[PDB]
Amino acid sequence: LSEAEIARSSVENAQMRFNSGKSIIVNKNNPAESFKRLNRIMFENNIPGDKRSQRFYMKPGKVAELKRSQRHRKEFMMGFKRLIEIVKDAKRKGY
Amino acid sequence: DGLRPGDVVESFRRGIPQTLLNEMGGKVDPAILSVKTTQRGNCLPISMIPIGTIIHNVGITPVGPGKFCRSAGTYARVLAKLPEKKKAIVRLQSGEHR
Amino acid sequence: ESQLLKKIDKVFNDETEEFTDAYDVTSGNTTLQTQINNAI
Amino acid sequence: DSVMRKRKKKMKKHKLRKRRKREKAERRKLSQ
Amino acid sequence: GHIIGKLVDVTEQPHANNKGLYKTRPNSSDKRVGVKRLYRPPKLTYVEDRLRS
Amino acid sequence: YKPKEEVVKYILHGKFTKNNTHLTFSSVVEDKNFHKNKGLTYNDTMLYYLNLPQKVKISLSTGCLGFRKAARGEYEAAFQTSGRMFELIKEKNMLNKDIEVVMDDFGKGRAAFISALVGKEGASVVKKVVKISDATKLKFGGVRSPKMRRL
Amino acid sequence: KYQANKNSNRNDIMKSGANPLEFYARPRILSRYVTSTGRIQHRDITGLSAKNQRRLSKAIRRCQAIGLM
Amino acid sequence: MLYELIGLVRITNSNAPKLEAKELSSTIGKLIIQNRGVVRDIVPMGIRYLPKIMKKDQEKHFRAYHFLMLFDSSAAVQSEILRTLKKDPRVIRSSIVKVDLDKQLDRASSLHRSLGKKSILELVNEDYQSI
Amino acid sequence: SGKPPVYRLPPLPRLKVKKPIIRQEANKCLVLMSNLLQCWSSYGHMSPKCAGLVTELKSCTSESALGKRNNVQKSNINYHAARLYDRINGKPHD
Amino acid sequence: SSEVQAACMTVRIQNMANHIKEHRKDFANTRNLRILVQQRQAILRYLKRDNPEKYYWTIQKLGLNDAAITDEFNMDRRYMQDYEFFGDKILIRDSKKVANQKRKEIRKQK
RNA sequence: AUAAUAGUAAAGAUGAAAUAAUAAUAAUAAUUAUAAGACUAAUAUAUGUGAAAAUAUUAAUUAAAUAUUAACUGACAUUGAGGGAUUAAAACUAGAGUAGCGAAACGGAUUCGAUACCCGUGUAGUUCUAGUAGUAAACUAUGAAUACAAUUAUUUAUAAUAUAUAUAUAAAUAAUAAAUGAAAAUGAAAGUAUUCCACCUGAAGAGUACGUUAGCAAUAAUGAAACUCAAAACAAUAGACG
């Protein structure tokens, strides 16, 4: 009927309202999968690689050159995957 | 620095004037004192000056005149306020927090 | 000013609906029917 | 040009820079 | 049976178009040359295909 | 009215750099008499709950276990330190309340840490952990990190 | 292997034709195109048109500016 | 120029979240409506939480009452309305944004054109037809 | 509708994979060990049930440590790629 | 027609010259202003070559003379100095030219 | 960086240690409070825009920019010596600021030596306002414009035939035919032609000396001759070497 009493019933809600997206609950039975998926979600955000690159400074020209090199490598690999798929299909079809 | 003939300045050492006192509903309630609290030219007690403001003509005692940072181009910065001890830390142009 | 007071009162009345956008509403036509009415 | 003539020009520019650095006093004296 | 190499002159159409504007001068399309269309292989189409689909 | 503090949760922080490993154990403290007394508004109590005060209990690095100088950034030294934390937690027996494990940058001791945590030594401390997070911190803007290392 | 994500395709209103920049005031709609920490997904993952993606990025960056994200 | 502002008005009175939102809206609407300005639409987005704690006017606010205002005014008037909004401690975050009027004079708020309805006329027509 | 576009490659000297991942199967004599270790950890070292797994290890180890190893094939995807790259690449005529 | 073109870009010139006065630092806009002014010169030179009566009628209506259309104009910093586009000197004469002008200040009895 | 709470004996760097900071408050690490300078994460391709230099945290004011149609005008166009404006980083002149990085300097390292590569402290600089100067591998090492020439694939924009995305036209990119080329290669051009501007005539001397011009200065522009020589240079081929 006053303040600070209804608050205790809402503090938990307030807490999960502010979440960074890194919150993870580990399974009681086995912890291996919890860390394993935490490891994977570290990679999917690339915070390992970017932190590694963040320790030293690189010239704007060099970062642009590196960014272009990586993009081409990714594009080339995807094109190679495509051609590999088509050759596998053609092999199956009898060609 | 920017005072020119035509601008209006006021002093609030006695305290908030009557005009604002009868305008408390539209003056103090919205806390639009900040409009006049941090304005160039007017003089306030350090109690009402927000932390970080650049100030001059700084006194030492409540019933005393300004004594510090009166020379050409001089300024001082208010750092902290201690209501319990009735003292305020005022960074001073020589660089000595007093 | 009168319109401002009335509209603000209507909008901010607790009874008046609010769209918190928590969920996606499942549920145009009236505009097209009105257009066909005023065109035919 | 290639890096051959680029190297040659670099050395000539460097030598000219050093020569003009050493003769700073004489330049100042002659130009008042 | 469409004809390739025919350009409808402005004089040919005196009547207003669908939007009621009379065409009095050739437009950007008429300026351009269409040799490629003459040498392009024709695109064969039959009404029967729509029904078959 | 009268400060009545108490412990609710425990936090274990693991920092792992290229040359050292730092493990810190702290305990979350809060006061329930705080909200019993009036004079505080709604935002006060949420500010208080949202930011839980903490006090450090056990703080050690790999230098505390006989590793000196170069050997402070290797797999084995981190492993022993992680195990040391667990047995310290065990001897302190703070397992009473669950532990939240935050994480920090890699170095080489992260692998040692999670191995000891999931190892048989820590097989009996995992039971008091529910939530795990990573705080490996990054820089959206810039502070002009040092130059290359022309090694 | 051929598992497609056409469920998204039918449910991403962003590719339906709607202007992304309009949705800057609805955090949730953009919330499904940000990763756990808010990083904007690359064009490959989102799969939108170049113009739609660029407008979506502007919308989310703006939405961050007003502070809804 | 048609303008559209997102307001994030602080709520110290948790009992009356609309109260200080009501007062702030009345004040700045007053400022705009005497100032050769027309208010187009005001509608609230509700009591929602800030994504991260923001420390404004000596308070680490966690939640604010988000509300909408669509109005027309001159560039000078709107700039100074923004100035009043920033300086005032009753609002912790604000951001105006214009709406292009070169194609259509009547344009609804972002949250409405996000939906199927595209203009105020559509809103009223739907209201009348459904009721 | 607007699916991601297809990216081709410039003409290449050849199409091949460095170290193709050819299918292979474990001996399962190591798997037998893994199961036996699990039984030892849970039931107890050389526990009765583990004894059955113990005998399985004995059978898989008696003749070879990794048991009989066979079914060691190689992937000929490089052969097919080199065989029909000249046709599948879609290069412009001469 | 040339006169209508000149009048239209005259309005544009006035407006965006006012902008340039307001924003001294912008340089791309200054480039557009110079280009547009030169365009007005070119069309008016044609108008002279075709219909002189309209030429003089329109240039006197806008506020320009035959001089300000035929001569080369480059929006030089000397133009902004002379005609007080901003109010302060931008170019600086060297003591050679300055002293040359100083000496040239004969103040002859005449 | 400062302060507080707890909390220990070590912390920081390196291939490894010391230079600088620890049980003199008592660090390092963790959690909080305050100030400051700088920068801008995915998006992301600098895509794209811009005359170039440049340009991606958000909102606003001003100016410019695209395609189609209608009308208008009437060869009013292209190039452009001289000239004018803008021009990265460094540099200089006043005034604010200086968190982090960091010429120089001083120390610690490796080496026989190390005037360096590695480590510490780190002044100028790096930041904002007003300026000076007008230089770069300022590069697509490729001036602008016009007419034309055979294909393919992917994106972007326009047009209603539609029934609910097939059909034609423009631009960019990528691979080519012909052509060109010393070849590597270019492939709306480095092809077929036309017009205008800038520049080249062996190497070294030398973009040096002298003169002049301009700058606060560092310097920028212009710019020779004497002595010597039968050299000098690019593409590609085959080895040897790493």
Ligand SMILES: [Mg+2]
């Ligand atoms: Mg050359």
Ligand SMILES: [Mg+2]
């Ligand atoms: Mg000289």
Ligand SMILES: [Mg+2]
């Ligand atoms: Mg002398």
Ligand SMILES: [Mg+2]
């Ligand atoms: Mg190491």
Ligand SMILES: [Mg+2]
């Ligand atoms: Mg012209």
Ligand SMILES: [Mg+2]
């Ligand atoms: Mg610390």
Ligand SMILES: [Mg+2]
């Ligand atoms: Mg970015």
Ligand SMILES: [Mg+2]
């Ligand atoms: Mg481009």
Ligand SMILES: [Mg+2]
């Ligand atoms: Mg160009």
Ligand SMILES: [Mg+2]
């Ligand atoms: Mg004629």
Ligand SMILES: [Mg+2]
């Ligand atoms: Mg020209």
Ligand SMILES: [Mg+2]
């Ligand atoms: Mg010239």
Ligand SMILES: [Mg+2]
């Ligand atoms: Mg740059």
Ligand SMILES: [Mg+2]
């Ligand atoms: Mg200075």
Ligand SMILES: [Mg+2]
């Ligand atoms: Mg440093």
Ligand SMILES: [Mg+2]
């Ligand atoms: Mg150093």
